[PDB]
Amino acid sequence: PVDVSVSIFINKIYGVNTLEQTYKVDGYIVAQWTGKPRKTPGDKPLIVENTQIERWINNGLWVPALEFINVVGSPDTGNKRLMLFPDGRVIYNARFLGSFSNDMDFRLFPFDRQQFVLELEPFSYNNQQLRFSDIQVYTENIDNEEIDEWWIRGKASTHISDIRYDHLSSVQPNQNEFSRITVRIDAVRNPSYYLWSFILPLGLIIAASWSVFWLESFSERLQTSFTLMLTVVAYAFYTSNILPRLPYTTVIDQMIIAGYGSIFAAILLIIFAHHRQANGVEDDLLIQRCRLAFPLGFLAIGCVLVI
Amino acid sequence: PVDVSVSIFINKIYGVNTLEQTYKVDGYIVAQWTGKPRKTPGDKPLIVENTQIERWINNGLWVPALEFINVVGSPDTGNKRLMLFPDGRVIYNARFLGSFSNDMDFRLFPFDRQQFVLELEPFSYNNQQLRFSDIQVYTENIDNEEIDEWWIRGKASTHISDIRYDHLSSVQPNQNEFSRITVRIDAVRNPSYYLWSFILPLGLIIAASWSVFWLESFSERLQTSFTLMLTVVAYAFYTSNILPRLPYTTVIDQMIIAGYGSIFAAILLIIFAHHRQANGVEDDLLIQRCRLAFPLGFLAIGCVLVI
Amino acid sequence: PVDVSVSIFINKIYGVNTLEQTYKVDGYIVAQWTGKPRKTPGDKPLIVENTQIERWINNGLWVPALEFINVVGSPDTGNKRLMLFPDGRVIYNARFLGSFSNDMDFRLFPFDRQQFVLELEPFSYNNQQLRFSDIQVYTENIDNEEIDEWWIRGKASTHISDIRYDHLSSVQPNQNEFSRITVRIDAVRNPSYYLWSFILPLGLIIAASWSVFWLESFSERLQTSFTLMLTVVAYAFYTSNILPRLPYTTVIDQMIIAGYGSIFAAILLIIFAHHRQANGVEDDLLIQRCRLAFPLGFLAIGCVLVI
Amino acid sequence: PVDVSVSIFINKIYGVNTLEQTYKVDGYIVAQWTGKPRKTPGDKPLIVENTQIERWINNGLWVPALEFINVVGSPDTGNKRLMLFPDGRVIYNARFLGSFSNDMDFRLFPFDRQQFVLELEPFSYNNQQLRFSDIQVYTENIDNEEIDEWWIRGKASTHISDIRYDHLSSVQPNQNEFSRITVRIDAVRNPSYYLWSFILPLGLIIAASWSVFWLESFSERLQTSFTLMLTVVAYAFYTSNILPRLPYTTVIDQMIIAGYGSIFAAILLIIFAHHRQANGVEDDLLIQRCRLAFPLGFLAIGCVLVI
Amino acid sequence: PVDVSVSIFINKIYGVNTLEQTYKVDGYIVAQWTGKPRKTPGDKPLIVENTQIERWINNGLWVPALEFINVVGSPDTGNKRLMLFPDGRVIYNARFLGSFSNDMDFRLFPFDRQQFVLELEPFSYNNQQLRFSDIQVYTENIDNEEIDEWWIRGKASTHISDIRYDHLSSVQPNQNEFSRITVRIDAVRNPSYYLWSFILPLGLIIAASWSVFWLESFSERLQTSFTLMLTVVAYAFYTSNILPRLPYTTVIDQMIIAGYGSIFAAILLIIFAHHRQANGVEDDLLIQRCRLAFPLGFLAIGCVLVI
Numbered sequence A, B, C, D, E: 001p002v003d004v005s006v007s008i009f010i011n012k013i014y015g016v017n018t019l020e021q022t023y024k025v026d027g028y029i030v031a032q033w034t035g036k037p038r039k040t041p042g043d044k045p046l047i048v049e050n051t052q053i054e055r056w057i058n059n060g061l062w063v064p065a066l067e068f069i070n071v072v073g074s075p076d077t078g079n080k081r082l083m084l085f086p087d088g089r090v091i092y093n094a095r096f097l098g099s100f101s102n103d104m105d106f107r108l109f110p111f112d113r114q115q116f117v118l119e120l121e122p123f124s125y126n127n128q129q130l131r132f133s134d135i136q137v138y139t140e141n142i143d144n145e146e147i148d149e150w151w152i153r154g155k156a157s158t159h160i161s162d163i164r165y166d167h168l169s170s171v172q173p174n175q176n177e178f179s180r181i182t183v184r185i186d187a188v189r190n191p192s193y194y195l196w197s198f199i200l201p202l203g204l205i206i207a208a209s210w211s212v213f214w215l216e217s218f219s220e221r222l223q224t225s226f227t228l229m230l231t232v233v234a235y236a237f238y239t240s241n242i243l244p245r246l247p248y249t250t251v252i253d254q255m256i257i258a259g260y261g262s263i264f265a266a267i268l269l270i271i272f273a274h275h276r277q278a279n280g281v282e283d284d285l286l287i288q289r290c291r292l293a294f295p296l297g298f299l300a301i302g303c304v305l306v307i
């Protein structure tokens, strides 16, 4: 059972696709194992780049194909390198840019916590043939957190395991466990942009909605919530067109639903204030003055949606 | 007639193109058929990965090309593996990402039922040369329905059948039936996002539209439905910029039309109210008070569109 | 002069690009021609799939390149197959997906009739070297038009001709006419979406524009016409974002220009009615009541557009 | 010094990318030169299609690589052809699709004059080794300009010149001038769509803005200018979503700023009119009756854009 | 320790992706080194183009792969050229187009200062095997600055350095410093388009907002502030849709925030003016006439955000 020791060097994690639950990783794989000793020129290690690697594989060099289990599509492999040592050991070094897949929950956007994952697994060789000895992951990142969209928490957490593959086994009974390296990088979204540019003005819109009650006439009170309604639509349009695509409501979506709610609720009280009377124009002196009543009724219903 | 056994492993079904009637399928194919026995190194099955498979083919390994009938474009093939057993049998295993085509009706969106389909068929060998012995499909999915756009329902239908290509047959008469594997995976759309952020406020807009009759003045009444019209336009827009491209009207698309209708029907009633008179300002006390007439008249005419 | 029988089987015609004048065709080419008899294994027809065709060609197999004349870029090719019969004859079968070029008039959108074309031609052999014996095209489609964007009308037109490249001929004089196959598929656009979701409400906006004249005051008449204008801009905006980009105006675009007009004409009359007076508010006592005059005056200006 | 004759046949010029200063050119390249006499099968010219050309190159056939100096990326090449004549001469024919770069000024859009340029040059051979003997360009386009976005004007300009790369020469001193073919194709934009759907309504918006002065009251005069303001924004938007992305203002863009200006200037005058007084309500019966004054001040700013 | 002399020729720097922090570079690499003397045809340096380069490599030509350290994905390579001299020296020449990554701060857009960076380093060989003797960069760009998006300021930066990978060294101890060429080009953004088309009209929007205090009534003062609010939303939208996407606010983003605030402060002062009284309509003679107060109060807070 060949021991393969791995090092992944992560260069940039970028381009998160909310819809596809996808993110881009550029970096390097280094894979090392020990073969039977060789005679290299001089005595110095033999270097074999790109094209020539296939030539060595033809003359019988075992260079096992390691699949990125959760890569969507197949990665752009940059340069490849075989490092063949005379003491026997073999190093395969190559650059890759890949699009990777992971479960991503975006429901509390723009306050999501996500985690970026890599899954390596030898493509054709079982655990009894090729085994992952160890893995080091190097996230050569740090600093400039507010210039980048995401805050990396940890240093990269790792777990090597055995996967079975209990569908038709049968082919090779007793031996259908593959060893799998699983690298996880934890991360937090830097919400500033979304707070100041989406959350804040959506609030000023929402708040200023409640100023509909400081209007004197019923005609004023009502004709204005129609403009005010048109505003939340202008906003939802502005919001939706800019924000990441998801198949669900995020927190910001709910804020917008709440805007439609306060305003539609406003419409109802306002019409109600007017026509519920003991004459015709008996506008409920206190209900018309719910100018404080439901702004804080919104903030109570607001603090409960937080739970 | 070579018996070929297939097993398809479905990893991710994503990216439905509504206009193109398209979806993405990531997975693995395993194909097995049995040959004349080989003398393999050691005695354990021989592994041939990617490039070396072509090398084996140039030397006469029969690897029959299995075509994805309904793949739009030609799939992204990942690692390929030939697994050659001494008892003769041959296993072809490769990872694939493909764009598949199937008839998709999205009329009752966002509540569509869809079925993601795969059709396998040997590219050059007929039922009398190469035959599909059996096929199993494994969708090793589970959990997180409320996170995903699509909810898979069954375990996946399978069907092997025989296709008669009766166009110039003639070339090889009597032997022009190809055997076809058909996988069908049932699905339902996640209607939550479309309900809460589209259906709901669209209703509040349509509903608030009716509050125009609670206005005292005629000029207020009329000038108002023009802001109100401007609303359903800004809203139809927000919908169409965000919702999926189609060549037909969905349930939402209709709501928008009924939206335009209520307002335009209103405008007419309002002018009628005013100008159908025996003086100038004889507003039909009852017709100006059709505040209940067409709000509940909209629910009957609205629900008849459901039949 | 080698006789080539061609047969194209059309699977999907999708993805029309209105600015670039483009469409996608997925299907298969089958080309048949006859060589000197071969000694094939058994005596049965010899099959050569993908990778191997190029190999036979290094050993002198003439497999002439047939070019897609009006293809944009170079086609996505699926599986290749040579079918080599012992009596001499040779059949080439391949799958393709290509983006094709053709003149397309979209002036009468959403009611265009279009025709999707394939133009095949030998890439290197003239009419005296390679000639198209015949060509048949099978678009084994039918049914479900109300699901697809386009409705195919005919069964496909065919045309074999001779193309005379008379630019420097000279090199090989008297012999530079290549034989060309031309396929034609007629189609009609499915106007349903555009009828209900563009034409109808745009008609309602314009119609409701005319309701400006039932407004009592001048202040009312002119201000409401500003909202009216903004609704046509909001509509102008919703139209252009969803509708296909063209370098010319369609029918829907004109309805829009007509909209801005009916509204701008009213602005002018409305100011006129009021300021053309013998006192100050002498709205030409009758002209303000052109409530019927220019709506049907619009429909006549509308039918002058039948020309 | 090898004499090479070139002929380019342009099939389609399309897809102008304003931002990147790029356009697509599809066509064929033909190059002819005279080698040492050969013995071809029969004695008529030998044809070598695609794959097979490298094979001929591997055996010492000089097929010199001619680079498209201004191509963005590397061209999509379709079928390749070698034509080997017994008298020595060699013909290289290939189809290409390329994105080419040239300086493009889009300021006076939608009436720009652009020129599509192709630049050809041997990649590895200097003027003393390989020289462009002559070149002719064929624009086999014609008819129906009214359906196409761009109108090709001339019959294509041609220039063979010598480029002196005087950077370290040194390597090969006295000999580092490359021969360069320059093709120029002038064209004009189809101004129809933009005149009718941008300029005409952009104008009617700006014009109707001026009706603010026929409003009687000060509220009306001031408040409407705000609604009037929102319209130039909504119009600014539609303009921006549809029109080409540039790093500078176009004519229309300036038209839009002028819309914003006329309205902001009106805001001031309207306020000035009201408050420049000898009472409170000394509304300049005249400055409020600059109803003719500043529409022609706009026609003046309009004619100043020409100076 | 092989001396490699490098020269980069920059053709075009374009296509900057703000979210990915990406930009496109088209140009040429020249690499020169001296090997052991060769026997070339004639005595003139031998030319080996594209395809034939690998053929020389398979015969043992050392052609070391130079990695673009900071490239995103792997470059589109055009023509390659090997120039093999009799005296030993070898020149590698290739055109390339790549997307490169560099840290980009876009906080004070549109008044950005950026620097476009290229990083070269041998993929497999350290400082002791392969060393960069010198490098010159030629950016033969100039002029028409007001036509191109970015104004290249300095000439070109050059820095050869030694990178110490101190990760498992071990494998090759004492020798794991690679020599790195770093090219820096400074550039400044052309702020014209965003000034004249964004900054300016945004300013006129904000300013014309303050005129709400010149309105006589409270309803005039309040209701208009809502149309004023919807106008900022409209502008936010138009801005957002056109401007480059980033994860943080730029200057324009703040202007919009300031716009939202100014309107909300107005909603407040205005309601307050009205209800802070000793009667009911005692509109504070100074606070109603904060017509100068907070137009200038915005200018100090506007001037303090700059400092």
Ligand SMILES: CN1CCN(C(=O)O[C@@H]2c3nccnc3C(=O)N2c2ccc(Cl)cn2)CC1
Residues within 6 Å of the ligand: A067, A121, A122, A123, A124, A165, A166, A167, A168, A169, A171, A178, B009, B028, B030, B083, B091, B093, B140
């Ligand atoms: C990464 N590597 C290991 C797994 N492979 C694989 O084994 O494929 C399928 C697979 N994919 C998903 C889930 N289960 C299975 C399974 O049981 N397979 C299988 C089963 C038998 C044989 Cl001979 C080959 N493959 C592809 C290459």
Ligand SMILES: CN1CCN(C(=O)O[C@@H]2c3nccnc3C(=O)N2c2ccc(Cl)cn2)CC1
Residues within 6 Å of the ligand: B067, B121, B122, B123, B124, B165, B166, B167, B168, B169, B171, B172, B178, C009, C028, C030, C083, C091, C093, C138, C140
């Ligand atoms: C998957 N497969 C079966 C179909 N092949 C082929 O049959 O293509 C066509 C095809 N496509 C669609 C409908 N009918 C036909 C037909 O009659 N064909 C055909 C073409 C050539 C020959 Cl020799 C025999 N048959 C190619 C490979």
Ligand SMILES: CN1CCN(C(=O)O[C@@H]2c3nccnc3C(=O)N2c2ccc(Cl)cn2)CC1
Residues within 6 Å of the ligand: C067, C121, C122, C123, C124, C125, C165, C166, C167, C168, C169, C171, C178, D007, D009, D028, D030, D091, D093, D140
């Ligand atoms: C199908 N086809 C590809 C184009 N080929 C070719 O003929 O190239 C050009 C071409 N393209 C478009 C229009 N006319 C011509 C012409 O007259 N050509 C030409 C010019 C010289 C020689 Cl030797 C051969 N052909 C020939 C066969």
Ligand SMILES: CN1CCN(C(=O)O[C@@H]2c3nccnc3C(=O)N2c2ccc(Cl)cn2)CC1
Residues within 6 Å of the ligand: D067, D121, D122, D123, D124, D165, D166, D167, D168, D171, D178, E009, E028, E030, E083, E091, E093
């Ligand atoms: C078509 N083409 C191929 C590449 N060639 C080349 O000359 O590239 C560079 C280049 N590109 C742009 C501007 N100047 C130069 C220069 O002086 N070069 C150069 C550098 C070294 C050597 Cl040996 C030869 N040429 C020139 C002709």
Ligand SMILES: CN1CCN(C(=O)O[C@@H]2c3nccnc3C(=O)N2c2ccc(Cl)cn2)CC1
Residues within 6 Å of the ligand: A007, A009, A028, A030, A083, A091, A093, E067, E121, E122, E123, E124, E125, E165, E166, E167, E168, E169, E171, E172, E178
């Ligand atoms: C340009 N070139 C040199 C080095 N390569 C390389 O060094 O890969 C990794 C790498 N990438 C990023 C950061 N550090 C390292 C490291 O220490 N590696 C490594 C791992 C094993 C061996 Cl033998 C040599 N080097 C990449 C290609």
